[PDB]
C-alpha cells in the first residue's frame, strides 16, 4: 500500500512519533505498513499496533454511540445517514485489523505471548463489530471463538498474573456480560481471574506486580458494578 516504499524501521519510528503527537490515525497507518512488511512483530511493536487502532476505533465507537442515542430519541433521514456513515467507517477499521491478523499475524505467531495477544485482538474487533451489528449471531460467535482459543492457550502457557492473560480475561468477561448476554459467566470469569492472579502475586517483582494489579483493578471495577 501507500507505506510500501518506507523502511520498516522508519514506519516503527514514525508510529512512536505519531503516538507522541496524539496522531492515532497516522500511527495506525504506519503500523499497518509495518505489519505488511511481512515480518513478525516484537512485543513493543504489537503494543504500538494495538494502541494505534484502539484509539482510532475508540473515537469511532464513542461517536457511534452519541449518534445512535440521538437516532433512537428521534424515533428526516440525516441522523440515520450520518450514524450509518460512522458505522461503516468503524466497520472498515475493524475489517482492516482483522485482515492484518488473518494475513498473516496469527498464523505466524508461534509463541504464547504473541498468539494470545493476536487472538485477543481478533476477539476485540469482532466485539466492536458486534456492538453495531443488527450476521449479528455469527459475528458474536467469531468473537467468542477467538477469545476462547486465546483463553485455552493462556491457561496452558501463561501464569495467572500475566498481563496479557489478565487483559484477555477482562475483555472476554465484558463480552460475556453485554454482547453474549451471559452476565453470570462474566462475573464468574472476572472473579476466578482476579482470585487466581491474587494468589500468584507473591511470585512477582515490584514492576510485574504493578503491571498485574493495574488490570486486576479493572476486573474489580467491573465486578463492583455487576454485583
Amino acid at each position: 500500500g501507500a507505506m510500501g516504499s518506507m523502511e520498516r524501521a522508519s514506519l516503527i519510528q514514525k508510529a512512536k512519533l505519531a503516538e507522541q503527537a496524539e496522531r492515532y490515525e497516522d500511527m495506525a497507518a504506519f503500523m499497518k505498513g509495518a505489519v505488511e512488511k511481512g515480518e513478525e512483530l516484537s512485543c513493543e511493536e504489537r503494543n504500538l499496533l494495538s494502541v494505534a487502532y484502539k484509539n482510532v476505533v475508540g473515537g469511532q465507537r464513542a461517536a457511534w454511540r452519541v449518534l445512535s442515542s440521538i437516532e433512537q430519541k428521534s424515533n428526516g433521514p440525516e441522523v440515520r445517514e450520518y450514524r450509518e456513515k460512522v458505522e461503516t467507517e468503524l466497520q472498515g477499521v475493524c475489517d482492516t485489523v482483522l485482515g492484518l491478523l488473518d494475513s498473516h499475524l496469527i498464523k505466524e505467531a508461534g509463541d504464547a505471548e504473541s498468539r494470545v495477544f493476536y487472538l485477543k485482538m481478533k476477539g476485540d474487533y469482532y466485539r466492536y463489530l458486534a456492538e453495531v451489528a443488527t450476521d449479528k449471531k455469527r459475528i458474536i460467535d467469531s468473537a467468542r471463538s477467538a477469545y476462547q482459543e486465546a483463553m485455552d492457550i493462556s491457561k496452558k502457557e501463561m501464569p495467572p498474573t500475566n498481563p496479557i492473560r489478565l487483559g484477555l480475561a477482562l475483555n472476554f468477561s465484558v463480552f460475556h456480560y453485554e454482547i453474549a448476554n451471559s452476565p453470570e459467566e462474566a462475573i464468574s470469569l472476572a472473579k476466578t481471574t482476579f482470585d487466581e492472579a491474587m494468589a500468584d502475586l507473591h511470585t512477582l517483582s515490584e514492576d510485574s506486580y504493578k503491571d498485574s494489579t493495574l488490570i486486576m483493578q479493572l476486573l474489580r471495577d467491573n465486578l463492583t458494578l455487576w454485583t
Binding site: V51, N55, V56, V57, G59, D124, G167, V174, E178, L219
Partner: peptide, 12 residues
C-alpha cells in the same frame, strides 16, 4: 451508555 472497563486505551 455505561461502558465497562476493558484493556488498554480508554479511547471511547
Amino acid at each position: 451508555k455505561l461502558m465497562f472497563k476493558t484493556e488498554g486505551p480508554d479511547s471511547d
